[PDB]
Coordinates of C-alpha atoms in Angstrom, one line a residue:
Chain A
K10 CA 78.1 137.3 101.4
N11 CA 81.9 136.8 101.8
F12 CA 83.8 135.2 104.8
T13 CA 86.0 137.7 106.8
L14 CA 88.3 137.6 109.9
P15 CA 88.6 140.1 112.4
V16 CA 91.9 142.2 111.9
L17 CA 92.6 142.0 115.4
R18 CA 95.8 141.1 117.2
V19 CA 96.5 138.3 119.4
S20 CA 97.3 140.8 121.9
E21 CA 93.8 142.8 121.2
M22 CA 91.7 139.6 121.6
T23 CA 90.4 137.5 124.7
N24 CA 90.5 133.6 125.4
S25 CA 87.0 132.1 125.0
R26 CA 87.4 129.8 127.6
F27 CA 88.4 132.0 130.2
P28 CA 87.9 136.0 130.8
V29 CA 91.4 136.9 130.0
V30 CA 93.8 138.5 127.2
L31 CA 95.6 136.1 125.0
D32 CA 99.2 135.8 125.3
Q33 CA 100.1 133.7 122.1
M34 CA 99.3 131.1 119.9
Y35 CA 100.4 127.5 120.8
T36 CA 100.0 123.9 118.6
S37 CA 100.5 120.3 120.4
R38 CA 99.6 117.3 119.4
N39 CA 97.5 116.1 122.5
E40 CA 98.2 112.4 122.2
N41 CA 95.0 110.2 123.7
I42 CA 93.5 113.3 124.7
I43 CA 89.7 114.3 123.5
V44 CA 89.8 117.9 122.6
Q45 CA 86.2 118.9 123.1
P46 CA 85.8 122.4 125.1
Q47 CA 82.3 123.5 125.5
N48 CA 83.1 127.2 125.8
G49 CA 84.9 128.9 122.7
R50 CA 82.9 126.7 120.3
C51 CA 81.2 128.3 117.0
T52 CA 81.0 127.3 113.3
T53 CA 82.5 129.7 111.0
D54 CA 78.7 130.2 109.7
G55 CA 78.4 131.7 113.3
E56 CA 76.0 128.8 114.8
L57 CA 77.4 128.7 118.9
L58 CA 77.8 125.6 120.2
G59 CA 78.1 124.2 123.5
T60 CA 77.9 126.1 126.3
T61 CA 79.4 129.5 124.6
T62 CA 78.0 132.3 125.4
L63 CA 78.7 135.9 123.5
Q64 CA 79.9 138.1 126.5
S65 CA 83.7 137.1 127.5
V66 CA 83.0 138.6 130.8
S67 CA 80.6 135.8 131.4
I68 CA 82.6 132.7 131.1
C69 CA 83.2 131.0 133.6
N70 CA 80.5 132.6 135.7
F71 CA 77.4 131.4 137.7
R72 CA 74.3 133.3 138.4
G73 CA 71.4 132.5 141.1
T74 CA 70.5 132.4 144.8
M75 CA 71.5 130.7 147.7
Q76 CA 69.2 127.6 148.5
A77 CA 70.9 126.4 151.6
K78 CA 74.1 126.6 154.0
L79 CA 75.0 122.7 154.5
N80 CA 76.9 121.4 157.6
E81 CA 80.1 120.2 155.1
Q82 CA 82.1 121.8 153.2
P83 CA 81.4 123.0 150.4
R84 CA 79.1 124.5 152.7
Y85 CA 77.1 126.9 150.1
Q86 CA 74.5 125.8 147.6
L87 CA 73.6 127.5 145.0
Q88 CA 70.2 127.4 142.7
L89 CA 71.3 128.9 139.5
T90 CA 69.5 130.8 136.5
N91 CA 70.9 131.2 133.1
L92 CA 73.5 134.4 133.9
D93 CA 70.9 136.5 131.9
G94 CA 68.6 136.2 135.0
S95 CA 65.7 134.0 132.7
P96 CA 65.2 130.7 134.2
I97 CA 66.9 127.2 133.3
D98 CA 64.6 125.7 130.7
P99 CA 65.6 121.8 131.1
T100 CA 64.5 120.8 127.9
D101 CA 67.8 123.3 126.3
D102 CA 69.8 121.8 123.8
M103 CA 73.3 122.8 125.9
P104 CA 75.4 120.5 128.0
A105 CA 74.6 123.0 130.9
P106 CA 73.9 126.5 131.6
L107 CA 75.8 129.3 128.9
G108 CA 79.1 130.0 130.6
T109 CA 79.4 127.2 132.7
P110 CA 83.3 126.1 132.9
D111 CA 84.6 123.3 130.5
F112 CA 87.4 122.6 132.7
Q113 CA 88.1 120.4 135.8
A114 CA 89.9 122.0 138.2
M115 CA 89.0 124.0 141.3
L116 CA 87.7 127.2 140.1
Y117 CA 88.8 130.7 142.5
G118 CA 86.4 133.4 142.6
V119 CA 84.2 135.5 144.8
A120 CA 81.0 135.0 145.1
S121 CA 78.6 138.3 145.6
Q122 CA 75.3 139.1 146.7
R123 CA 72.9 142.1 146.9
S124 CA 69.8 142.2 149.1
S125 CA 66.8 143.6 146.9
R126 CA 65.2 144.8 149.3
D127 CA 67.7 147.5 150.8
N128 CA 70.4 147.1 148.4
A129 CA 72.7 146.1 151.1
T130 CA 75.6 144.0 149.6
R131 CA 78.7 141.3 150.6
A132 CA 81.0 139.3 149.2
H133 CA 83.5 136.6 150.1
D134 CA 86.1 134.4 148.4
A135 CA 84.5 130.9 146.8
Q136 CA 85.9 128.0 145.1
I137 CA 84.0 125.5 143.2
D138 CA 85.4 122.2 142.4
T139 CA 84.1 121.4 139.1
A140 CA 85.1 117.8 139.2
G141 CA 83.1 117.4 142.6
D142 CA 80.5 115.0 143.1
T143 CA 77.8 117.8 143.8
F144 CA 78.8 119.4 140.7
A145 CA 75.7 119.3 138.6
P146 CA 75.2 122.8 136.9
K147 CA 72.5 121.1 134.2
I148 CA 70.2 120.7 136.9
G149 CA 71.0 123.8 138.4
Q150 CA 73.0 122.4 141.6
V151 CA 76.6 124.4 142.3
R152 CA 78.2 123.9 145.8
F153 CA 81.0 126.7 146.6
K154 CA 83.4 126.9 149.7
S155 CA 84.3 129.6 151.4
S156 CA 86.0 130.9 154.7
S157 CA 83.3 133.4 155.2
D158 CA 80.1 133.0 157.4
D159 CA 78.9 136.3 155.6
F160 CA 76.2 135.3 153.6
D161 CA 72.5 135.2 153.7
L162 CA 70.4 132.8 152.6
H163 CA 68.4 133.4 149.7
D164 CA 69.8 136.6 148.3
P165 CA 70.4 136.9 144.7
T166 CA 74.3 135.4 144.2
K167 CA 77.0 136.0 141.5
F168 CA 80.1 133.9 141.1
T169 CA 82.8 136.0 139.2
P170 CA 86.2 133.9 138.7
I171 CA 89.5 134.8 139.0
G172 CA 91.3 131.5 138.3
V173 CA 92.2 128.2 139.9
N174 CA 93.8 126.6 142.7
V175 CA 95.9 124.0 141.9
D176 CA 96.8 121.3 144.6
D177 CA 97.7 117.1 144.6
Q178 CA 94.0 116.4 145.6
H179 CA 92.8 119.3 142.8
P180 CA 94.6 119.1 139.3
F181 CA 93.8 122.1 136.6
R182 CA 93.1 119.3 133.9
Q183 CA 91.7 121.7 130.9
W184 CA 90.5 119.0 128.4
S185 CA 88.9 116.8 131.1
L186 CA 85.2 117.8 131.0
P187 CA 82.8 118.1 133.8
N188 CA 80.0 115.9 134.5
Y189 CA 77.3 118.9 134.0
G190 CA 74.6 116.6 135.5
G191 CA 76.8 115.3 138.3
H192 CA 78.5 112.1 138.8
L193 CA 75.1 110.0 138.6
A194 CA 74.7 110.9 134.8
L195 CA 75.7 111.5 131.7
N196 CA 76.7 114.8 129.3
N197 CA 74.5 115.5 126.4
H198 CA 74.0 118.2 123.8
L199 CA 77.9 118.2 123.8
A200 CA 79.7 120.3 120.9
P201 CA 81.6 117.8 119.2
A202 CA 85.2 116.4 119.6
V203 CA 87.7 118.1 117.3
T204 CA 91.0 116.6 115.9
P205 CA 93.2 117.2 112.6
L206 CA 92.3 114.7 110.1
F207 CA 95.3 115.2 108.0
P208 CA 98.5 114.1 107.7
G209 CA 101.0 116.1 109.1
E210 CA 98.4 118.6 110.8
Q211 CA 97.9 119.7 114.3
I212 CA 95.6 121.7 116.2
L213 CA 96.1 125.7 116.5
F214 CA 95.5 126.8 120.1
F215 CA 95.2 130.7 121.0
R216 CA 96.4 130.7 124.7
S217 CA 96.5 132.3 127.8
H218 CA 97.8 132.0 131.4
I219 CA 95.1 132.4 134.2
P220 CA 95.4 133.1 137.9
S221 CA 96.0 130.8 140.2
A222 CA 95.7 130.5 144.2
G223 CA 97.9 127.8 144.2
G224 CA 100.6 125.6 143.1
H225 CA 103.4 125.9 140.4
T226 CA 101.2 126.2 137.5
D227 CA 101.5 128.3 134.6
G228 CA 97.9 128.3 134.1
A229 CA 98.1 127.1 130.6
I230 CA 94.4 127.6 129.1
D231 CA 94.1 126.6 125.1
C232 CA 90.6 127.8 122.9
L233 CA 90.1 127.1 119.4
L234 CA 88.6 130.8 118.5
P235 CA 89.2 134.1 119.9
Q236 CA 85.9 135.3 121.6
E237 CA 86.2 138.3 119.1
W238 CA 86.1 135.7 116.1
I239 CA 83.1 134.3 117.8
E240 CA 81.3 137.5 118.3
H241 CA 82.1 138.4 114.4
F242 CA 80.8 134.8 112.8
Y243 CA 77.9 135.2 114.9
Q244 CA 77.0 138.6 113.6
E245 CA 78.4 138.0 109.8
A246 CA 76.8 134.4 109.6
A247 CA 78.5 133.7 106.3
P248 CA 78.1 130.6 104.2
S249 CA 80.1 127.7 103.8
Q250 CA 81.6 127.3 100.1
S251 CA 83.4 124.0 101.7
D252 CA 84.1 122.4 104.9
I253 CA 87.8 124.6 105.0
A254 CA 88.6 128.1 104.6
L255 CA 92.1 128.7 104.2
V256 CA 93.8 131.4 106.0
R257 CA 97.1 133.1 105.9
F258 CA 98.9 134.7 108.7
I259 CA 100.1 138.2 107.6
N260 CA 102.6 140.6 108.9
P261 CA 101.4 144.0 107.9
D262 CA 104.6 145.2 108.4
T263 CA 105.6 143.6 105.2
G264 CA 102.4 142.5 103.4
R265 CA 104.2 139.0 103.6
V266 CA 102.7 135.7 104.5
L267 CA 104.1 134.2 107.6
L268 CA 102.1 130.9 107.9
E269 CA 99.0 129.2 106.4
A270 CA 96.2 127.2 108.1
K271 CA 92.9 125.9 107.7
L272 CA 90.2 127.1 109.5
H273 CA 87.5 124.0 109.7
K274 CA 83.7 125.1 109.1
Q275 CA 83.6 123.6 112.6
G276 CA 85.5 126.2 114.3
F277 CA 89.3 125.2 114.7
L278 CA 92.6 125.8 112.8
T279 CA 94.7 123.0 111.8
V280 CA 98.5 123.9 111.0
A281 CA 101.3 121.5 109.8
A282 CA 103.1 121.6 112.7
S283 CA 104.7 118.7 115.0
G284 CA 105.0 118.8 119.1
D285 CA 104.0 121.1 121.5
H286 CA 105.1 124.8 121.4
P287 CA 104.2 128.5 121.1
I288 CA 103.8 129.7 117.7
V289 CA 106.2 133.2 117.5
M290 CA 105.2 135.8 115.1
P291 CA 105.2 139.7 114.7
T292 CA 102.8 141.2 117.1
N293 CA 100.7 143.3 114.5
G294 CA 100.3 139.8 112.4
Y295 CA 96.7 138.7 112.3
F296 CA 95.1 135.7 109.8
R297 CA 93.1 136.8 106.2
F298 CA 90.6 134.7 104.4
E299 CA 92.4 133.7 101.4
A300 CA 89.7 131.3 99.7
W301 CA 87.5 128.1 100.5
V302 CA 89.3 124.8 99.3
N303 CA 88.3 121.1 99.1
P304 CA 89.5 118.3 101.4
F305 CA 92.8 117.3 100.1
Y306 CA 94.9 121.0 100.4
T307 CA 98.7 120.2 102.1
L308 CA 99.8 123.1 104.0
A309 CA 103.8 123.8 104.2
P310 CA 105.4 123.7 107.4
Chain B
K17 CA 82.6 152.4 103.1
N18 CA 79.1 152.3 105.0
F19 CA 78.8 153.2 109.0
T20 CA 77.1 150.1 110.5
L21 CA 76.3 149.0 114.3
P22 CA 76.5 145.1 116.0
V23 CA 73.1 143.5 115.8
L24 CA 73.7 142.6 119.4
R25 CA 70.9 142.4 121.7
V26 CA 71.5 144.7 125.3
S27 CA 71.5 141.5 127.2
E28 CA 74.1 140.3 124.5
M29 CA 76.5 143.2 125.1
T30 CA 79.3 144.6 127.8
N31 CA 79.9 147.5 129.9
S32 CA 82.6 149.4 128.5
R33 CA 83.3 151.1 132.2
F34 CA 83.3 147.9 134.1
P35 CA 83.8 144.1 132.7
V36 CA 80.1 143.3 133.4
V37 CA 77.0 142.1 131.3
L38 CA 75.2 144.9 130.3
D39 CA 71.5 145.5 132.6
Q40 CA 69.4 147.7 130.7
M41 CA 69.4 151.3 129.1
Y42 CA 68.6 154.7 131.4
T43 CA 68.7 157.8 130.9
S44 CA 69.5 160.9 133.5
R45 CA 69.7 164.6 133.8
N46 CA 72.8 164.6 135.2
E47 CA 72.4 168.4 136.1
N48 CA 75.2 170.2 137.7
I49 CA 77.5 167.0 137.4
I50 CA 80.4 166.9 134.6
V51 CA 80.1 163.5 132.5
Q52 CA 83.6 162.8 131.3
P53 CA 84.1 159.1 131.5
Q54 CA 87.7 157.7 130.6
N55 CA 86.6 153.9 129.6
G56 CA 84.4 153.6 127.0
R57 CA 85.2 156.2 124.9
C58 CA 85.6 155.7 121.2
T59 CA 84.3 157.9 118.1
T60 CA 82.3 156.2 115.7
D61 CA 85.3 156.1 113.0
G62 CA 87.2 153.8 115.4
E63 CA 89.4 156.2 117.4
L64 CA 90.3 155.2 120.7
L65 CA 90.3 158.0 123.7
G66 CA 90.5 158.2 127.3
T67 CA 91.7 155.1 129.0
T68 CA 89.8 152.5 126.9
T69 CA 91.3 149.3 126.0
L70 CA 89.8 146.9 123.4
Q71 CA 89.4 143.6 125.7
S72 CA 86.6 144.3 128.0
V73 CA 88.3 141.4 130.8
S74 CA 90.7 144.0 131.0
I75 CA 88.6 147.2 132.5
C76 CA 89.7 147.9 136.2
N77 CA 92.1 145.6 136.3
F78 CA 96.3 146.6 137.0
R79 CA 99.1 144.5 136.1
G80 CA 102.6 144.6 137.7
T81 CA 105.3 144.2 140.3
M82 CA 105.2 143.8 144.3
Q83 CA 107.3 146.7 145.4
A84 CA 107.2 146.9 148.8
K85 CA 105.2 146.2 152.0
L86 CA 104.5 149.5 154.1
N87 CA 103.7 149.6 158.2
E88 CA 100.3 151.2 157.1
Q89 CA 97.1 150.2 155.6
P90 CA 97.0 149.8 152.6
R91 CA 100.4 148.3 152.9
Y92 CA 100.7 147.2 149.3
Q93 CA 103.0 148.8 147.2
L94 CA 102.9 148.1 143.4
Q95 CA 104.6 149.5 140.5
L96 CA 102.6 149.0 137.9
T97 CA 103.2 148.0 133.9
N98 CA 100.8 148.7 131.2
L99 CA 98.8 145.3 131.1
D100 CA 100.5 144.3 128.3
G101 CA 103.6 143.9 130.2
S102 CA 105.5 147.2 128.4
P103 CA 106.7 150.0 131.0
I104 CA 104.6 152.8 131.9
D105 CA 105.6 155.9 129.5
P106 CA 105.2 159.0 131.5
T107 CA 105.6 160.9 128.1
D108 CA 102.3 159.3 126.5
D109 CA 99.0 160.9 125.8
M110 CA 96.9 159.1 127.9
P111 CA 95.5 160.1 131.1
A112 CA 96.6 156.7 132.6
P113 CA 97.3 153.2 131.8
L114 CA 94.5 151.3 129.8
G115 CA 92.0 150.0 131.6
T116 CA 92.7 152.5 134.8
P117 CA 89.4 152.3 137.0
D118 CA 87.8 155.9 135.6
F119 CA 85.5 156.3 138.8
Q120 CA 86.4 157.5 142.5
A121 CA 85.6 154.0 144.8
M122 CA 87.1 151.4 146.8
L123 CA 87.4 148.8 144.2
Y124 CA 87.2 145.2 145.3
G125 CA 89.0 142.2 143.7
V126 CA 91.4 139.5 144.0
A127 CA 95.6 140.4 143.9
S128 CA 97.3 137.2 142.6
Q129 CA 100.7 136.6 141.7
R130 CA 103.2 134.2 139.9
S131 CA 106.9 134.3 140.4
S132 CA 109.3 134.6 137.4
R133 CA 111.9 132.0 138.7
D134 CA 109.4 129.1 138.7
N135 CA 105.8 130.5 138.4
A136 CA 105.1 130.0 142.2
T137 CA 101.4 131.3 142.9
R138 CA 98.9 132.7 145.4
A139 CA 96.0 135.0 145.2
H140 CA 93.6 136.7 147.9
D141 CA 91.7 139.8 148.1
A142 CA 93.0 143.4 147.3
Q143 CA 91.1 146.4 147.7
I144 CA 92.3 149.7 146.0
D145 CA 91.5 153.0 147.0
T146 CA 90.8 155.0 143.8
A147 CA 90.2 158.4 145.4
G148 CA 93.4 158.0 148.0
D149 CA 96.1 160.5 148.1
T150 CA 98.5 157.8 146.9
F151 CA 96.4 156.5 143.9
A152 CA 98.8 157.6 141.2
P153 CA 98.1 155.3 138.3
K154 CA 99.4 157.7 135.7
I155 CA 103.5 157.4 137.1
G156 CA 102.5 153.8 138.0
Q157 CA 102.1 153.6 141.9
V158 CA 98.9 151.8 143.4
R159 CA 98.8 150.5 146.7
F160 CA 96.3 148.0 147.5
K161 CA 94.7 146.5 151.1
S162 CA 94.6 143.1 152.0
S163 CA 93.8 141.2 155.2
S164 CA 96.4 138.5 154.1
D165 CA 99.9 138.7 154.7
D166 CA 100.7 136.0 152.0
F167 CA 102.3 138.2 149.4
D168 CA 105.7 138.1 148.1
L169 CA 107.8 140.9 146.9
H170 CA 109.4 141.8 143.7
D171 CA 106.8 139.0 142.3
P172 CA 104.4 139.5 139.0
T173 CA 101.1 140.6 140.6
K174 CA 97.8 141.1 138.8
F175 CA 94.8 142.7 140.2
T176 CA 91.6 141.5 138.8
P177 CA 89.0 143.5 139.8
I178 CA 85.2 142.1 141.0
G179 CA 83.2 145.3 141.9
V180 CA 83.3 147.8 145.2
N181 CA 82.9 148.1 148.4
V182 CA 81.0 151.4 150.1
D183 CA 81.0 152.5 153.3
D184 CA 80.5 155.8 154.6
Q185 CA 84.3 157.1 154.1
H186 CA 84.3 155.5 150.5
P187 CA 81.3 156.2 148.5
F188 CA 80.7 155.1 144.9
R189 CA 80.8 158.2 142.8
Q190 CA 80.6 156.8 139.1
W191 CA 80.8 160.6 137.7
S192 CA 84.1 161.6 140.1
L193 CA 87.5 161.1 137.9
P194 CA 90.3 159.7 140.2
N195 CA 93.3 162.1 140.4
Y196 CA 95.0 160.2 138.0
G197 CA 98.6 161.5 138.6
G198 CA 98.6 161.3 143.0
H199 CA 97.9 163.7 145.5
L200 CA 95.3 166.4 144.0
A201 CA 97.2 166.6 140.6
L202 CA 96.6 167.6 137.0
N203 CA 95.0 165.1 135.3
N204 CA 95.6 165.4 131.1
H205 CA 94.5 164.0 127.6
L206 CA 91.2 163.5 129.4
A207 CA 88.4 162.3 126.7
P208 CA 85.9 165.5 127.1
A209 CA 82.8 165.8 128.8
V210 CA 79.4 165.0 127.1
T211 CA 76.4 166.8 126.9
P212 CA 73.4 166.9 125.1
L213 CA 73.4 170.0 122.4
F214 CA 69.8 169.9 121.9
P215 CA 66.3 170.9 123.1
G216 CA 64.5 167.8 125.1
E217 CA 67.3 165.5 124.8
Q218 CA 69.2 163.5 127.2
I219 CA 72.0 161.0 127.1
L220 CA 71.3 157.3 126.4
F221 CA 73.3 155.2 129.0
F222 CA 73.8 151.4 129.1
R223 CA 73.4 150.7 132.9
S224 CA 75.1 147.2 134.5
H225 CA 75.1 147.0 138.4
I226 CA 77.9 146.0 139.6
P227 CA 79.0 143.9 142.4
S228 CA 79.9 145.6 146.1
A229 CA 81.3 143.8 149.0
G230 CA 79.5 146.3 151.5
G231 CA 77.2 148.9 152.1
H232 CA 73.7 149.8 150.6
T233 CA 74.3 150.1 147.0
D234 CA 72.7 149.5 143.4
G235 CA 76.2 149.3 141.9
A236 CA 74.9 151.2 138.8
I237 CA 77.5 152.1 136.5
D238 CA 76.6 154.1 133.2
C239 CA 78.5 153.8 130.1
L240 CA 78.3 155.8 126.5
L241 CA 78.9 153.0 124.2
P242 CA 78.9 149.1 124.4
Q243 CA 82.3 147.8 124.7
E244 CA 80.8 145.5 121.4
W245 CA 80.1 148.8 119.9
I246 CA 83.7 150.6 120.3
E247 CA 85.5 147.1 119.1
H248 CA 83.4 147.3 116.1
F249 CA 84.1 150.8 115.6
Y250 CA 87.9 150.7 116.0
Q251 CA 88.0 147.9 113.5
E252 CA 85.5 149.4 110.6
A253 CA 87.1 153.1 110.7
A254 CA 83.8 154.1 108.9
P255 CA 83.6 157.6 108.3
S256 CA 80.9 160.0 109.4
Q257 CA 78.9 162.3 107.1
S258 CA 77.9 164.6 109.9
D259 CA 77.9 165.3 113.4
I260 CA 74.7 162.9 113.8
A261 CA 73.8 159.6 113.0
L262 CA 70.0 158.8 113.6
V263 CA 69.7 155.4 114.8
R264 CA 66.4 153.3 115.7
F265 CA 66.0 150.2 118.1
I266 CA 64.0 147.7 116.1
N267 CA 62.1 144.9 117.0
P268 CA 63.8 142.2 114.5
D269 CA 61.0 140.0 113.8
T270 CA 58.4 142.6 112.3
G271 CA 61.0 145.7 111.7
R272 CA 58.6 148.1 113.7
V273 CA 60.7 150.9 114.8
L274 CA 60.5 151.5 118.8
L275 CA 62.7 154.3 119.4
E276 CA 64.5 156.5 117.6
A277 CA 68.2 158.1 118.8
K278 CA 71.3 160.0 117.9
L279 CA 74.3 158.6 117.7
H280 CA 77.0 161.3 118.2
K281 CA 80.2 161.0 116.2
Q282 CA 82.4 161.6 119.3
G283 CA 81.0 158.5 120.8
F284 CA 77.6 158.9 122.7
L285 CA 73.9 159.0 122.4
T286 CA 70.8 160.9 123.0
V287 CA 67.4 160.4 123.4
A288 CA 64.1 162.4 123.7
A289 CA 63.5 162.1 127.6
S290 CA 63.4 163.8 130.4
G291 CA 64.2 162.7 134.4
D292 CA 66.2 159.5 135.6
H293 CA 64.7 156.4 134.6
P294 CA 65.2 153.0 132.7
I295 CA 64.9 153.6 128.9
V296 CA 62.0 150.3 128.8
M297 CA 62.7 148.1 125.6
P298 CA 61.5 144.9 124.2
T299 CA 64.7 142.5 125.5
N300 CA 65.0 141.4 121.3
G301 CA 65.5 144.8 120.0
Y302 CA 68.6 146.6 118.5
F303 CA 69.7 149.8 117.3
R304 CA 70.2 150.1 113.3
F305 CA 71.5 152.6 111.4
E306 CA 69.7 154.8 109.2
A307 CA 71.5 157.9 108.2
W308 CA 73.6 160.8 108.7
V309 CA 71.6 163.9 109.4
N310 CA 71.7 167.6 109.9
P311 CA 71.8 169.3 113.1
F312 CA 68.3 170.3 113.3
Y313 CA 66.3 166.7 113.0
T314 CA 63.9 166.4 115.8
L315 CA 63.6 162.7 117.5
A316 CA 60.6 161.0 118.2
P317 CA 59.8 161.2 122.5

């Protein structure tokens, strides 16, 4: 069972941390930041981790029923299920339901309902502060704010994300994890933090720019693996013959290698690079597996 | 090379006609309807058809610029690009830009903006009538209605779909194609209509129930192939040995065959069934390719 990567171009792939297409590759040092995303987490042999779900359309989604309309904004209190409808097993080895956002922001989207008895429907804008005190998806408790009063108590309710809403009180901080159990509980069952552990290396990320309802923001969000790679590794389940798969970015227009990287079995890439900047490449380019290498392989810048 | 199918469960896959998870499999006679969807169209050897795009998150999206505000609803005039940013080439051998909706409805979502000069952002609800005379995505002309006046001219604008909005004047008609060129024009480069070609057979659909902002509607939308199968075929490009691949839905724990279907090389499935009803199958099963069969193969009911 040989290890392989999808052949898709960057522009043919999807961010694994928000439901949007990829725009570019990007590297950064992330000085003093703990890089520990919970979406887009999969080992090279196909073990999904954190809150990672298989369908990109489900990233940053919530599903459940409307438990209550409270007095204070955010007035609307959800009681969550898993996105497949199945109930929330609290003994589960996940930090929160699959698909839960893994960053702190005001998440902007639409809350929609369907009444089961007659299929009556309604939907309005909804915002969820993933840094807020009542944000406790682990225990199934999320609240959203909406300018509308047209919601039915107890109907099935879906939150579809659109983007963020940035203001001085609500920054978009992509590397700051929510407290999935609210501010009175510590996060658990987390996918591990990632960092380069070799001199002169930085993580190579796949970057998108997500919509915003407010602010002068580029909406940049960086994932460790395209969602399509996760789907592929889950299917292939190829064994790891070392801790590092050496991969080469090849331009099929020329047959030439333009970049070497290390694909770590834990599910992230590193390159020999310095600084925070995009990695510009021909658009038909894609990574190919080359070989499993030992732990001291040096990458050419 | 050999033909294969992904091993994903139905609940692990995505509709190819709207950016939502699959709910179930379903069959219908569709008597006296022309079933000719343009999204989710791909041959088994990986040739994309209609308006099919690879990223599920792009289905029913639009991208462009705010060209003008008009005096009458729908006031907001977009001039589209392709979803990648490139300009619309009327020459193209496509019925409309990749991802354009392939049904008549009031499509409900959010229009977001980011200014080119400095990334100033805003986003509000947007509704696009894909049955309206002025809906002409083929030539890049799409108007949306919004209750907000907080949109700015000549800024890059993205439409992210959420669902539909059904009322008496605006039904959701999943099998009625838009007039992609505007004002009752001539659709071209269409993926062909599909029908079973064999006694006792009906098409097997992968169904989702999409959100709605109004009306009594189940939101049902039936696709011919899960998006994950499309992306697999596109990358594998495996040849066919006949017009029909026998595929078997199996329980993975035991190997027991639960259902036989025909996967037609043109990109759709048939089963031996009659009526309009779900195809009830254990949640953990999946289809496996068995063999390319001749035209006389009869399926188990």
